Coordinates of C-alpha atoms in Angstrom, one line a residue:
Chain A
X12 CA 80.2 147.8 75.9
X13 CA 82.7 149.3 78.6
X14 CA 86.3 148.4 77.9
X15 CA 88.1 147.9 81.5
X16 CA 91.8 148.9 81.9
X17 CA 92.4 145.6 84.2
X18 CA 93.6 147.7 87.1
X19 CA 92.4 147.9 90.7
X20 CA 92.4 151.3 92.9
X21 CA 92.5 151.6 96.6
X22 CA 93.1 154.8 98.9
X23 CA 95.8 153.9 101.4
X24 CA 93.5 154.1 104.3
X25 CA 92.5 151.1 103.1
X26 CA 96.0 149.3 102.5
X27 CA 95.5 147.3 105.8
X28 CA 91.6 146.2 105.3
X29 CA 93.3 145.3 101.8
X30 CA 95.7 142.6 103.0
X31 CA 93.2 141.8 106.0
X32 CA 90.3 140.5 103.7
X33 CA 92.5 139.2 100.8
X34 CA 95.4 137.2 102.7
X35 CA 94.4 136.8 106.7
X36 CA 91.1 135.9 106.4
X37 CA 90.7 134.1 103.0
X38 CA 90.3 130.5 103.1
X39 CA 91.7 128.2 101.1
X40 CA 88.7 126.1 100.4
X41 CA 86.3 128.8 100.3
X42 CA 83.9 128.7 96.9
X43 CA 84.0 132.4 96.1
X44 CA 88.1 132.3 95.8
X45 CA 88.1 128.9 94.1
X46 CA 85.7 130.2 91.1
X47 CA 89.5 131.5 89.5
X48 CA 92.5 129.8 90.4
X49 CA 95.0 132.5 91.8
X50 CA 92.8 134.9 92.2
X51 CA 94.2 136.8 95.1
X52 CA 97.5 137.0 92.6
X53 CA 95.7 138.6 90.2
X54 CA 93.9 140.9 92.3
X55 CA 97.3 141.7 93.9
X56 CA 99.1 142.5 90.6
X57 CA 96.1 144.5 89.1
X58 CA 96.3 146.2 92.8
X59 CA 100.1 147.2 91.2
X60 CA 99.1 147.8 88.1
X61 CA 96.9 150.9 89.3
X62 CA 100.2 152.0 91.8
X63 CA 102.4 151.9 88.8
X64 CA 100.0 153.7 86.9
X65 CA 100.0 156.5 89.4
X66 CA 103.7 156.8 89.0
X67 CA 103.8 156.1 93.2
X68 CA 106.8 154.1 94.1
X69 CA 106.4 154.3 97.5
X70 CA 102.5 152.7 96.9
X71 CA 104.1 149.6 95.3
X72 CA 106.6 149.6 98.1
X73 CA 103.6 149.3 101.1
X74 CA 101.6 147.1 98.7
X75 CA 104.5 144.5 98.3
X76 CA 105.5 145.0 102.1
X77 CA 102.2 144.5 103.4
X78 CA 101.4 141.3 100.9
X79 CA 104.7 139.5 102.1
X80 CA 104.4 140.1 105.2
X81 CA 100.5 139.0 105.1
X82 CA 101.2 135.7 103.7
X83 CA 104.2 135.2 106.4
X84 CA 101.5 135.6 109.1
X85 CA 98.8 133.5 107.5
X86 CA 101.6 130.5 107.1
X87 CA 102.8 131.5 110.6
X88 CA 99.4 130.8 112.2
X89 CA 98.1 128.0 109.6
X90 CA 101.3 126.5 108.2
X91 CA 100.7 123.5 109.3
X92 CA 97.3 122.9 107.2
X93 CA 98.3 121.8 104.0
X94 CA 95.9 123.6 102.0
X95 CA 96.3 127.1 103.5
X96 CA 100.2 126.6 102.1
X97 CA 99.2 125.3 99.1
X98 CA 96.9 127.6 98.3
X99 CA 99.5 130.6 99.3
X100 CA 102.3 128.8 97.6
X101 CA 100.2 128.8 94.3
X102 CA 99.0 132.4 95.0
X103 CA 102.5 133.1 95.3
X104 CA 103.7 131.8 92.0
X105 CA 100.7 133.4 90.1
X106 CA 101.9 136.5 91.6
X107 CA 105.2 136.2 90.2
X108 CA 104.3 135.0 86.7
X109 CA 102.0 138.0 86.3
X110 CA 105.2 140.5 87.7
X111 CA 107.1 138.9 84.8
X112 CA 104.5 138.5 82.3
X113 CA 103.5 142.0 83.0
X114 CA 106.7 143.2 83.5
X115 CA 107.5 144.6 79.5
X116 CA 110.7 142.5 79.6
X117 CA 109.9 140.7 75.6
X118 CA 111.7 137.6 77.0
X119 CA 108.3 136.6 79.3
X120 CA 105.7 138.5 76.3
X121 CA 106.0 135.1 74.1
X122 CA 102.6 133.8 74.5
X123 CA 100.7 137.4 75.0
X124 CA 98.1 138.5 73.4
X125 CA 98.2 141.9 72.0
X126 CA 95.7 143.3 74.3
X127 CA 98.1 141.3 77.3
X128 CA 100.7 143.5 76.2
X129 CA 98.8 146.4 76.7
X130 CA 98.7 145.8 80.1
X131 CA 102.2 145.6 81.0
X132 CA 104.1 148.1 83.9
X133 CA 105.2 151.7 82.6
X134 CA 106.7 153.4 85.2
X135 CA 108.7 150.6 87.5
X136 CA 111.6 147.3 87.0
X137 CA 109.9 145.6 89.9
X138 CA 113.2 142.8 89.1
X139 CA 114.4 143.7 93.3
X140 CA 110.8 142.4 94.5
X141 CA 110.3 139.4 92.3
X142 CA 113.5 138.2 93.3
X143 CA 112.2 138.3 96.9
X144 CA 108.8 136.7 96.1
X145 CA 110.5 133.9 94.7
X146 CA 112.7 133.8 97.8
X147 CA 108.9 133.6 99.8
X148 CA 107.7 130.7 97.2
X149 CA 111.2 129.1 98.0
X150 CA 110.1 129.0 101.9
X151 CA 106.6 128.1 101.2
X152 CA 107.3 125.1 99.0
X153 CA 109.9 123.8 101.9
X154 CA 106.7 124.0 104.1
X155 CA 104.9 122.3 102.0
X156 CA 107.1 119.5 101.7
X157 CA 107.3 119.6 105.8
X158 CA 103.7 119.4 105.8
X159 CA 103.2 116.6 103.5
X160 CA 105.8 114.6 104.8
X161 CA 104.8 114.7 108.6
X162 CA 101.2 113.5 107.1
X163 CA 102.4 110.6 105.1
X164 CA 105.2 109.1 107.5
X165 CA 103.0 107.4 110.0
X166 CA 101.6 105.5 107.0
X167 CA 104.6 104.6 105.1
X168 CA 106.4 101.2 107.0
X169 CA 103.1 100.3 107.3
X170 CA 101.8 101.0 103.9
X171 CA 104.8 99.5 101.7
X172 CA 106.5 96.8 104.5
X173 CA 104.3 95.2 107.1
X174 CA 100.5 95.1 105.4
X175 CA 100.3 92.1 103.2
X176 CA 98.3 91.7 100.0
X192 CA 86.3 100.9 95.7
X193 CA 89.4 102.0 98.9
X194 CA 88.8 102.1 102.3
X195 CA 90.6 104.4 104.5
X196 CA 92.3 101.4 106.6
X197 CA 92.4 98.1 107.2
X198 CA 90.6 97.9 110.6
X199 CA 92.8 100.6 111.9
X200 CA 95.9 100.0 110.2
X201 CA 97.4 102.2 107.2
X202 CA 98.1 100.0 104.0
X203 CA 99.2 101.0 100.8
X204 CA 95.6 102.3 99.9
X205 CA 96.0 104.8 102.8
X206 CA 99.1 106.2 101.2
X207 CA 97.3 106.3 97.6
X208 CA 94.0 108.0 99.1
X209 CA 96.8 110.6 101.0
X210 CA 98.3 111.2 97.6
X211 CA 94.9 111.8 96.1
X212 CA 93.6 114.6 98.9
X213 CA 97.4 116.3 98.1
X214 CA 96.8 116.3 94.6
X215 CA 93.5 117.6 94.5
X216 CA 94.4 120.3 96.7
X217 CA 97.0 121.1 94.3
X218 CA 94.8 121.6 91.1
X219 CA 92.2 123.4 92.3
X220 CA 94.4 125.9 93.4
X221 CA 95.8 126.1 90.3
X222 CA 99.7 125.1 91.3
X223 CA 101.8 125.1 88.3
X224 CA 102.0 121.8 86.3
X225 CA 105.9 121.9 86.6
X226 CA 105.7 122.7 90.0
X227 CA 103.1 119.8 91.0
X228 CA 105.5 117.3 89.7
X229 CA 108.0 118.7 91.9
X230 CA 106.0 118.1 94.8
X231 CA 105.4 114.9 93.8
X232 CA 108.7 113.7 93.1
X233 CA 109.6 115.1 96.6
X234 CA 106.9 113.2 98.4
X235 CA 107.9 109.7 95.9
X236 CA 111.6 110.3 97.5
X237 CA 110.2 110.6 100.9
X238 CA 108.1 107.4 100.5
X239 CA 111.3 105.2 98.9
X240 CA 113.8 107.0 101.6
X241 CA 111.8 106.0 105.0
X242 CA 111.0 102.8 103.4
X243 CA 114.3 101.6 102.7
X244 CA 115.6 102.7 105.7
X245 CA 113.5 100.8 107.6
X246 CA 114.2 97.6 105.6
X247 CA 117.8 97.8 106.3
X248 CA 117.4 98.5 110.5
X249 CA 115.1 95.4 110.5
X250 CA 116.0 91.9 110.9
X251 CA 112.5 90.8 109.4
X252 CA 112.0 92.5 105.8
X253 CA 114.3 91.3 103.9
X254 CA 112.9 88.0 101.6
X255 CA 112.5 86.7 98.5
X256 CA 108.7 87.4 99.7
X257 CA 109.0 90.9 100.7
X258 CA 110.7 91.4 97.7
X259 CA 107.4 90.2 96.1
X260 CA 105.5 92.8 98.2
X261 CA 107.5 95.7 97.7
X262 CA 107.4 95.4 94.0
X263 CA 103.5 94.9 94.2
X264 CA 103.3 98.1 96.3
X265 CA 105.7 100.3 94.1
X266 CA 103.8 99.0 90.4
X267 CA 100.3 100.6 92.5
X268 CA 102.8 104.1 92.8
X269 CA 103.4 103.7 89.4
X270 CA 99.8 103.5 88.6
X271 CA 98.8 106.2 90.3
X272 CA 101.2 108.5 88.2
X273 CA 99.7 107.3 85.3
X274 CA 96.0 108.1 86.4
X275 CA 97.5 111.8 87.1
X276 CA 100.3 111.9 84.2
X277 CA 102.7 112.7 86.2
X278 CA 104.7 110.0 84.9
X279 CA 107.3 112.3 83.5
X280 CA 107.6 113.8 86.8
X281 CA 110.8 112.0 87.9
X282 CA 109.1 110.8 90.9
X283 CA 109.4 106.6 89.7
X284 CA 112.9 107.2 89.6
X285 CA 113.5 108.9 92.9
X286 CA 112.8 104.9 94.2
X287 CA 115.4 103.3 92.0
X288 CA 117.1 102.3 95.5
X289 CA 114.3 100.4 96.8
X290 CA 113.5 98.9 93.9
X291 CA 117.3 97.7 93.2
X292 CA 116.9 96.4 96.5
X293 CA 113.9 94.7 96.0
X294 CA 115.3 93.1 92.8
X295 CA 118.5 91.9 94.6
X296 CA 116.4 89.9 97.6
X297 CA 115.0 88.1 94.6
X298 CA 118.1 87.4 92.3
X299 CA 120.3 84.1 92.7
X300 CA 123.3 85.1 95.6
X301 CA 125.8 82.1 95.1
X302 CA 128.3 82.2 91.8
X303 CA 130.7 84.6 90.6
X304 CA 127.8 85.2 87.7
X305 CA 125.3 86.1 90.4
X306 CA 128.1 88.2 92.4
X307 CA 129.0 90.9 89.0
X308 CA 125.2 90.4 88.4
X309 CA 124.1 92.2 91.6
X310 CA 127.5 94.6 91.0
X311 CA 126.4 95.5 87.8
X312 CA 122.2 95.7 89.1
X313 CA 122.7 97.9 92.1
X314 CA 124.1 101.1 91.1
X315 CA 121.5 102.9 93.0
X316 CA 122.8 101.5 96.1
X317 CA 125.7 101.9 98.6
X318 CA 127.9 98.9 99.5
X319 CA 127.0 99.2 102.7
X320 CA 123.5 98.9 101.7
X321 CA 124.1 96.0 99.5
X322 CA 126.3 94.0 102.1
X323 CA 123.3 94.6 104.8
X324 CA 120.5 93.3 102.6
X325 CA 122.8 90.0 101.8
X326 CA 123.5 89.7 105.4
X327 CA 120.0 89.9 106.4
X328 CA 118.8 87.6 103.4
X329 CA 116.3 85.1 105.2
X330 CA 115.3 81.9 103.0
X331 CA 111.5 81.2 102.7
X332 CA 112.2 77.3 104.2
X333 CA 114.6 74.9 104.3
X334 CA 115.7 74.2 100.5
X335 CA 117.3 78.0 100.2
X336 CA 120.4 78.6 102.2
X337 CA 121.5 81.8 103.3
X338 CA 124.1 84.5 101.9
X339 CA 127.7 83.1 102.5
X340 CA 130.7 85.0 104.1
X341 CA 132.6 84.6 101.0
X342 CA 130.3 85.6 98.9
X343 CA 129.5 88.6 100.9
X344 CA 133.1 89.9 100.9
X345 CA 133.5 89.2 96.9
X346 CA 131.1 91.7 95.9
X347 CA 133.5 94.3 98.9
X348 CA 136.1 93.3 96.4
X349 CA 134.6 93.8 93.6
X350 CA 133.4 97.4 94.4
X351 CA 136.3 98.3 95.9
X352 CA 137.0 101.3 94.1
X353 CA 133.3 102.8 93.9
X354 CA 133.9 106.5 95.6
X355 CA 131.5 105.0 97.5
X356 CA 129.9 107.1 100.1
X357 CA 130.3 104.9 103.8
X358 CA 126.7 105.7 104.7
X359 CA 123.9 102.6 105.5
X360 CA 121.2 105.1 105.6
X361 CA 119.4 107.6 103.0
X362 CA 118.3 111.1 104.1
X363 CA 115.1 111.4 103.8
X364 CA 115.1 115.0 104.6
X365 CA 116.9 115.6 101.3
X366 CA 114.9 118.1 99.1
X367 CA 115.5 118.9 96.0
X368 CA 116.0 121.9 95.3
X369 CA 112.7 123.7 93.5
X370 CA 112.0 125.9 90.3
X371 CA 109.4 127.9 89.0
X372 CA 109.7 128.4 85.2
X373 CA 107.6 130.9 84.2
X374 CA 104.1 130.5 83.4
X375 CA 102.2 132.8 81.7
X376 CA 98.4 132.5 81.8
X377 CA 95.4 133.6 78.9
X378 CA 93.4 134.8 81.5
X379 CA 92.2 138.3 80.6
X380 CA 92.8 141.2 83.6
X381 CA 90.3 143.2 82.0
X382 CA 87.5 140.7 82.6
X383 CA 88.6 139.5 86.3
X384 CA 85.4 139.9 88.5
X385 CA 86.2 140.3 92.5
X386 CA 83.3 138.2 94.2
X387 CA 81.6 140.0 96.1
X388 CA 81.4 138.1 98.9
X389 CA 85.4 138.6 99.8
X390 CA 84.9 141.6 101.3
X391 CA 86.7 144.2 99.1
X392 CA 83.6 146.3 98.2
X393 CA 86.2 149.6 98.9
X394 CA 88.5 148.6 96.0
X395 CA 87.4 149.6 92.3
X396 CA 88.1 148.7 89.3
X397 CA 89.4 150.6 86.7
Chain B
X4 CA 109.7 155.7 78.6
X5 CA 112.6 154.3 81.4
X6 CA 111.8 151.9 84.2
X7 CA 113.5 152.4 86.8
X8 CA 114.7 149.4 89.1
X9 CA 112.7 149.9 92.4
X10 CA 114.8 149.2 95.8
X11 CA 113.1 146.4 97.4
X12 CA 113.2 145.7 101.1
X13 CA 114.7 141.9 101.2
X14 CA 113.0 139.2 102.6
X15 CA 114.7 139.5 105.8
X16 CA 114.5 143.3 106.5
X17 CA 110.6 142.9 105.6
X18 CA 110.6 140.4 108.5
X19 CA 111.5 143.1 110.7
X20 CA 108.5 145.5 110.6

């Protein structure tokens, strides 16, 4: 043999029982839903498909209504479990890439097949209501990054300041850099088994690098204590093991290394010589990544590691003030690290076949068939 | 055959009921 047309039908009756058993109640590490990555987002567009098909505008309407307004519940009540947003994020992007790839617009029909084509919309420009499911994704990833960052910033002063140095999960008690790493791993996981776009993974990533250099720095430059030759030594260590960990999950195109350039400039300039006019334009020239406010408070908080290194001189200090004098500098000490960069999601068409989808029977959705 | 451009409900007005 039978050749499927890769649609779903449902009587309205059952709209409600239709959002209840395939947004409120899925979870987001349940086996059945996992089997396909954005699975519900197929379902759901198929669900369209068969609304479309029927020439019932007012179908597609109550379909979309009810499916937004699912997903804001589900993050409303669980938003602050990182996988149940990750997984409805993902779900949400699917969604969108199969209104677009679907949507007989030959801009997004690129990488179909010929029996993909077949399966595109007839009757409706559904344009209005992707433009508001990307508005939802826009919310979700915000959440996401909320969600992330409240988890990793109880580790992070720890994890790349204070602790010195198979994973353990602490060092009796205390979060080091491993903590952070094994954090980073659960995220990522998460994030590839739901099936979160490749483009959009780096994203996250980036986001949650920034976060980790932000709170970091910051903390270096309100205390008195972290800025040596030998913390230097440290934070370099600590951001090489970040950079490691890109490369085990090559995302090291993600632009997430870069987001630290200010830490690492000013881990570089606690280790660079601070007495000659050579070693002034040096550190002018090194730290473009950093404010001169920034600069002036890691020189004035310079501590030598004994008695044969003296510290920064007042002279010194205010030749490099002289010497970036007309940077349209900004007057700030601190970065915000609630900055977010703003996200995209380029479209990502998928091979996956609608006229072979299988709904697992164990979801629930027995009163939906497939056509 | 046309499609027409459905009138979507915004986010916001959807967050109503």
């Amino acid at each position: 043999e039978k050749d499927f047309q890769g649609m779903l039908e449902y009587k309205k009756e059952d709209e409600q029982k239709l959002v209840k058993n395939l947004i409120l109640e899925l979870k987001p590490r349940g086996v059945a839903v996992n089997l396909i990555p954005g699975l519900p987002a197929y379902i759901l567009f198929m669900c369209v498909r068969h609304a479309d098909y029927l020439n019932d505008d007012q179908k597609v309407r109550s379909l979309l209504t009810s499916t937004i307004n699912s997903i804001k519940k589900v993050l409303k009540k669980r938003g602050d479990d990182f996988e149940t947003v990750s997984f409805w994020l993902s779900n949400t992007c699917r969604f969108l890439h199969c209104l677009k790839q679907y949507s007989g617009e030959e801009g997004f029909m690129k990488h179909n097949t010929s029996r993909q084509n077949e399966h595109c919309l007839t009757n409706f420009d559904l344009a209005e209501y992707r433009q508001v499911l990307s508005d939802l994704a826009i919310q979700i990833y915000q959440q996401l990054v909320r969600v992330l960052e409240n988890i990793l910033q109880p580790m992070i002063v720890s994890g790349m300041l204070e602790h010195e140095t198979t994973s353990s999960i602490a060092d009796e008690g205390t979060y080091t850099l491993d903590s952070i790493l094994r954090q980073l791993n659960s995220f990522h996981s998460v994030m590839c088994q739901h099936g979160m776009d490749p483009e959009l993974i780096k994203q996250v990533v980036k986001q949650m690098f920034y976060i980790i250099g932000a709170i970091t720095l910051n903390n270096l430059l309100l205390r008195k204590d972290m800025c040596s030759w030998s913390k230097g030594m440290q934070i370099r260590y600590n951001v090489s093991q970040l950079e490691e960990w890109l490369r085990d999950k090559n995302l090291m195109n993600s632009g997430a290394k870069e987001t630290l350039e200010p830490l690492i400039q000013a881990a570089q300039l606690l280790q660079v010589k601070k007495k000659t006019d050579d070693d002034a334009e040096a550190i002018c020239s090194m730290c473009n990544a950093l404010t001169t406010a920034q600069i002036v408070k890691v020189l004035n908080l310079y501590t030598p590691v004994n008695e044969f290194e003296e510290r920064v001189s007042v002279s010194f200090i205010r030749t490099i003030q002289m010497r970036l004098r007309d940077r349209k500098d900004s007057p700030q000490l601190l970065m915000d690290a609630k900055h977010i960069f703003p996200v995209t999601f380029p479209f990502n068409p998928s091979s996956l076949a609608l006229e072979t989808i299988q709904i697992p029977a164990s979801l629930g959705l027995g009163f939906i068939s497939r056509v | 055959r046309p499609r027409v451009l459905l009138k979507a409900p915004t986010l916001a007005e959807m967050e109503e009921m």
